């Protein structure tokens, strides 16, 4: 899955640490990803950087997988790719619909 090797896929951590660490990293785009327990794929933990007061709006998503080619994973409802990372790249170098889309891989 060459996912745990990227700059955002942790291990045995869980969105908890991702958020616990992402929410503490304070990086306008700090994100990670992990394969939950009952997940049919992997979940990404993203963390942006809000102006002020409002406070950061960190968030995570589960890269939904399908049965096409390539589109194998999707973190939205149309964003399907066979490369969570690419998908990540997509959710960063494209439109995106999640927390200011992917940006910075704060991979613990």
């Amino acid at each position: 899955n060459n996912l745990e090797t990227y700059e955002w896929y942790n291990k045995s951590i869980s969105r908890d640490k991702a958020e616990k660490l992402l929410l503490d990293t304070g990086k306008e785009g700090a994100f990670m990803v992990r394969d939950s327990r009952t997940p049919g794929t992997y979940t990404v933990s993203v963390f942006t950087k809000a102006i002020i007061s409002e406070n950061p709006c960190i968030k995570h998503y589960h890269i939904k997988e399908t049965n096409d080619s390539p589109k194998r994973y999707y973190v939205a409802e149309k964003y399907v790719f066979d490369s969570i990372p690419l998908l990540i790249q997509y959710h960063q170098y494209n439109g995106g619909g999640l927390v200011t889309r992917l940006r910075y891989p704060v991979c613990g």
Partner: peptide, 6 residues
């Protein structure tokens, strides 16, 4: 329901 539903 258990993961920020995109």
């Amino acid at each position: 329901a258990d993961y920020e539903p995109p």
